[PDB]
Design an enzyme around this catalytic site. Structure first.
Site, short mmCIF file in Angstrom:
data_model
loop_
_atom_site.label_atom_id
_atom_site.label_comp_id
_atom_site.label_asym_id
_atom_site.label_seq_id
_atom_site.Cartn_x
_atom_site.Cartn_y
_atom_site.Cartn_z
N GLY A 74 -12.16 -3.79 2.20
CA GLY A 74 -13.23 -4.73 1.88
C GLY A 74 -14.49 -3.96 1.56
O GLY A 74 -15.00 -3.21 2.39
N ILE A 130 -12.22 -9.53 7.35
CA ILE A 130 -13.60 -9.97 7.16
C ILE A 130 -13.70 -10.88 5.94
O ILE A 130 -13.22 -10.55 4.85
CB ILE A 130 -14.56 -8.77 7.05
CG1 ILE A 130 -14.37 -7.83 8.26
CG2 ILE A 130 -16.00 -9.23 6.97
CD1 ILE A 130 -14.43 -8.50 9.60
N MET A 141 -8.96 -2.20 8.75
CA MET A 141 -8.39 -2.49 10.08
C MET A 141 -7.55 -1.39 10.69
O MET A 141 -6.90 -1.61 11.74
CB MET A 141 -7.56 -3.78 10.01
CG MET A 141 -8.37 -4.99 9.58
SD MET A 141 -7.41 -6.48 9.19
CE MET A 141 -6.61 -6.86 10.73
N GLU A 142 -7.54 -0.20 10.10
CA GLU A 142 -6.73 0.89 10.62
C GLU A 142 -7.40 2.26 10.64
O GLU A 142 -7.03 3.12 11.46
CB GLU A 142 -5.42 1.03 9.82
CG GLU A 142 -4.48 -0.17 9.86
CD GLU A 142 -4.76 -1.22 8.80
OE1 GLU A 142 -5.32 -0.85 7.74
OE2 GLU A 142 -4.43 -2.41 9.00
N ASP A 149 -11.55 -6.59 -2.39
CA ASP A 149 -12.39 -7.76 -2.13
C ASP A 149 -13.72 -7.26 -1.59
O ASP A 149 -13.83 -6.09 -1.26
CB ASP A 149 -11.72 -8.69 -1.11
CG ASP A 149 -11.51 -8.01 0.23
OD1 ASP A 149 -10.44 -7.39 0.41
OD2 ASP A 149 -12.43 -8.11 1.06
N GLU A 195 0.80 -1.22 0.00
CA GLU A 195 0.00 0.00 0.00
C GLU A 195 0.83 1.27 0.00
O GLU A 195 0.30 2.33 -0.31
CB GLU A 195 -0.95 -0.01 1.21
CG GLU A 195 -1.91 -1.20 1.16
CD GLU A 195 -2.73 -1.39 2.42
OE1 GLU A 195 -3.92 -1.77 2.31
OE2 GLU A 195 -2.17 -1.22 3.53
C1 LIG Z 1 -1.81 -11.07 5.73
C2 LIG Z 1 -2.47 -10.24 4.65
C3 LIG Z 1 -3.20 -9.04 5.23
C4 LIG Z 1 -4.46 -9.50 5.90
S1 LIG Z 1 -5.18 -8.22 6.87
C5 LIG Z 1 -5.80 -7.11 5.62
C6 LIG Z 1 -5.02 -5.79 5.49
C7 LIG Z 1 -5.60 -4.97 4.32
N1 LIG Z 1 -6.37 -3.87 4.96
C8 LIG Z 1 -7.67 -3.55 4.32
C9 LIG Z 1 -8.62 -4.66 3.97
C10 LIG Z 1 -8.86 -5.14 2.69
N2 LIG Z 1 -9.83 -6.11 2.70
C11 LIG Z 1 -10.25 -6.31 3.97
C12 LIG Z 1 -11.19 -7.19 4.63
N3 LIG Z 1 -11.92 -8.06 3.91
N4 LIG Z 1 -11.31 -7.11 5.98
C13 LIG Z 1 -10.60 -6.22 6.70
N5 LIG Z 1 -9.69 -5.36 6.19
C14 LIG Z 1 -9.52 -5.40 4.83
C15 LIG Z 1 -6.50 -4.18 6.40
C16 LIG Z 1 -5.18 -4.86 6.67
O1 LIG Z 1 -4.11 -3.89 6.73
#
Ligand SMILES: CCCCSC[C@H]1CN(Cc2c[nH]c3c(N)ncnc23)C[C@@H]1O
Ligand SMILES: CCCCSC[C@H]1CN(Cc2c[nH]c3c(N)ncnc23)C[C@@H]1O
Lengths: 232, 232
Positions: B78, B152, B173-174, B197, B12
């Protein structure tokens, strides 16, 4: 030695704050840090506010502005271990997030990527805490403390925690955040909290009734621990 | 004007970092801050690591060490709103924690005591972001973004969010942690993320496939936004 102490709520910091001589206040980022001497020992006491981000923000400011040698997290907690009663002490050997979940990518439940699955409290600090517990004839349990941003109040919230962390001795809302910040700055930490409720359907009522009792027990422990560390 | 930019993951921040001229790196508290000029504008770009506490710690260091005038949170998300496809932009008007629960004491779901129930993004920053979206002919939705410490991935986790925040347009998540820190320091913020996603049972597979696509769209938006703010 300068000892850093963190509590979330007014009730959890007020007894220690009142004992600080030559007290000064730093007000920054919505938190307050009180500096001075506690029974002769230099301390920096943070009132962080409630929850993970408040705790993280406050701990970061405390480390940056005061550079304490160690961090003690004081206050209340929801008891999970069967032998705990209101007022009893819980000492962290480790802290984990109960609400972190990146298991879709093969991390351990509660683990965030880039972090250990749990954050280990300092062995020397644990030993000093246990010595104080003995000297004060307190009932205590040492073990895993879990943190999240929810007040646990029976129902599905408690059930999930008992399911995922059957070894957790207590639950609260700041400790693991403090542990995480301390990990990233390589600063030793220990959590020394006391039980206000048992995190069941009645926990809000017990908390209202016994927060003050729990604050007093934790505060008296922390006072003893500060003295023990400064002397040794 | 100095513009602060925060991203959680390597993916990112990498495109923006590579565009920074005269780049310097600050390494503190387990995060990295890159300073220099982005198309002539002074910027401070934080790579925080994943989740609420990492974001809070990083944002606090960024504010303290770099004193940016505004904060832009970039990266993936997400998608929850029905018209969003992979690559599309989400702009915060507000951020809320989806995993905070002190409703036993009569706070709003997602609200922590001492905080507003949600944290409002800056109107001027939102307006500038919308102007960039128009100029770049992007598909975007403005609205509530919710944060927690879970990836999620359908099932009960998505269900709870759709239940409690049917108006949420995206989850990550931030963002709310950043918003909270910015609130406490009175620094304007906006979230400008792109969809990787749709947070369903397939979201881990979609995320692996489309993180890079989402990073590029958010990064290009942020580059445009930095220029627009510095010029105006
Ligand atoms: C080990 C690979 C990383 C897994 S944790 C996901 C990253 C990407 N960020 C955003 C993010 C995109 N899609 C999401 C989803 N479905 N749920 C929650 N957060 C998101 C939050 C976090 O910094
Ligand atoms: C508005 C009144 C405050 C409600 S939020 C509870 C306070 C006390 N802290 C510890 C705490 C004791 N019992 C608990 C329980 N059952 N669940 C989770 N945390 C706890 C965490 C937080 O700082």
């Amino acid at each position: 030695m300068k000892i850093g102490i963190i509590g979330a709520m007014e009730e959890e910091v007020t007894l220690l704050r009142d004992k600080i001589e030559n007290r000064q206040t730093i007000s920054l980022g919505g938190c307050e840090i009180y500096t001075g001497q506690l029974n002769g020992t230099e301390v920096a006491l943070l009132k962080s506010g409630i929850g993970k981000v408040a705790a993280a923000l406050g701990a970061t400011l405390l480390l940056e502005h005061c550079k304490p040698d160690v961090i003690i997290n004081t206050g209340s907690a929801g008891g999970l271990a069967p032998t705990l009663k209101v007022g009893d002490i819980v000492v962290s050997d480790e802290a984990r997030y109960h609400d972190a979940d990146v298991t879709a990518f093969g991390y351990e439940y509660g683990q965030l990527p880039g972090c250990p699955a749990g954050f280990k409290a300092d062995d020397k600090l644990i030993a000093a805490a246990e010595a104080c517990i003995a000297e004060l004839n307190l009932n205590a349990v040492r073990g895993l403390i879990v943190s999240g941003d929810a007040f646990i109040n029976g129902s599905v919230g408690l059930a999930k925690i008992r399911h995922n962390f059957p070894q957790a001795i207590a639950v609260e809302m700041e400790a693991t955040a403090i542990a995480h910040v301390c990990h990233n700055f390589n600063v030793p930490f220990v959590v020394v909290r006391a039980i206000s409720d048992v995190a069941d359907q009645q926990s809000h009522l017990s908390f209202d009734e016994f927060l003050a009792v729990a604050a007093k027990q934790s505060s008296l422990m922390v006072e003893s621990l500060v003295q023990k560390l400064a002397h040794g």
